[PDB]
């Protein structure tokens, strides 16, 4: 049982050691499309690339590339798109991906500015009456409503395909209180946020995969889909304590490199799953 594994690693202070064994064991697949010179300005970080086998392709004949990966968790029946925070020049590609993949939710785990630098383009409207038009991808985005709470904001957005005049409602879930340095002290507000995204229907198989991002789409984004998948597997299995968080993380790392960036994020992921689990038992 992980609760005991948690105390063992914690009492021994072995988090940096566990984390290194995960780094060592992690899959390595080609990322040739990401490294093409015509795609250099489509990537926020030169060392964070989608694998070719799991990359999301845009349906535009010119350049199909976006820094985004499909994470398919077969046993949990959960899919996620993990992506980088859009760049000024990729905001249109981001919304094209949301449209083409039939996503119902976008989960954002960063602020636009952190540590005095821009982590992300402002890719949604700030006011009802000031909609955004993405000329390159022929999409219109309108803010419908905004509900600001202590730890997160939920926004209802309308995305319109200007080509076909179809419209869809997108839910934007913005976790606003992840600290600039390290991880939250308690997973309570993170778990409430998770169950809010679930209650929305955004993680359900009758929609396309949820889009999850932070700045790089690997660290906080990793913690989100690791906690969700682990908790779902505990519901599904005859023996809930058969769930090994290290094994689940390695399965997820087949689909996108570097998920969970620090030993602190790994410790936080264990805490989140343990607390969530105990919130059933
Ligand atoms: C950590 C949280 S928040 C939340 N909201 C509604 N239902 C829940 N259960 C019991 C599945 C939870 C859990 C386990």
UniProtKB/Swiss-Prot annotation:
Q: Where does this protein chiefly localize? A: endoplasmic reticulum
Query: In which tissues does this protein get expressed?
Result: Expressed in keratinocytes (at protein level).
Which sequence positions carry the modification called Phosphotyrosine? 19, 65
Where substrate binds, per the record, is at 180, 214-220, 261
Any transmembrane segments, and where? none
Q: How does it sit in the membrane?
A: Peripheral membrane protein
* Gene Ontology annotations for the cellular component aspect, listed alphabetically: cytoplasm; cytoplasmic side of endoplasmic reticulum membrane; cytosol; early endosome; endoplasmic reticulum; endosome lumen; glutamatergic synapse; mitochondrial crista
- Cysteine sulfenic acid (-SOH) modification, residue list: 214
User: Locate the Tyrosine-protein phosphatase domain: which residues?
Assistant: 2-276
Mark the residues carrying the PTM S-nitrosocysteine: 214
Query: What EC number(s) would the UniProt record show?
Result: 3.1.3.48
Q: How is it modified after translation?
A: Oxidized on Cys-214; the Cys-SOH formed in response to redox signaling reacts with the alpha-amido of the following residue to form a sulfenamide cross-link, triggering a conformational change that inhibits substrate binding and activity. The active site can be restored by reduction. Ser-49 is the major site of phosphorylation as compared to Ser-241 and Ser-242. Activated by phosphorylation at Ser-49.
Name the consequence of residue 180 to A: Substrate-trapping mutant
Write down which residues bear the modification named Cysteine persulfide. 214
- GO MF term (any one): protein kinase binding
N,N-(cysteine-1,S-diyl)serine (Cys-Ser), cross-linked positions:
214-215
Report keywords, A-Z: Acetylation, Endoplasmic reticulum, Hydrolase, Membrane, Oxidation, Phosphoprotein, Protein phosphatase, S-nitrosylation
Q: What is catalyzed by this enzyme?
A: O-phospho-L-tyrosyl-[protein] + H2O = L-tyrosyl-[protein] + phosphate
The chain residues annotated with the modification Cysteine sulfinic acid (-SO2H) are 214
Subunit structure, per the record?
Answer: Interacts with EPHA3 (phosphorylated); dephosphorylates EPHA3 and may regulate its trafficking and function. Interacts with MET. Interacts with NCK1.
Q: Outline what the protein does.
A: Tyrosine-protein phosphatase which acts as a regulator of endoplasmic reticulum unfolded protein response. Mediates dephosphorylation of EIF2AK3/PERK; inactivating the protein kinase activity of EIF2AK3/PERK. May play an important role in CKII- and p60c-src-induced signal transduction cascades. May regulate the EFNA5-EPHA3 signaling pathway which modulates cell reorganization and cell-cell repulsion. May also regulate the hepatocyte growth factor receptor signaling pathway through dephosphorylation of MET.
Name the family the entry cites: Belongs to the protein-tyrosine phosphatase family. Non-receptor class 1 subfamily.
Question: Which protein, by its recorded name, is this?
Answer: Tyrosine-protein phosphatase non-receptor type 1
Species per Swiss-Prot/TrEMBL record: Homo sapiens
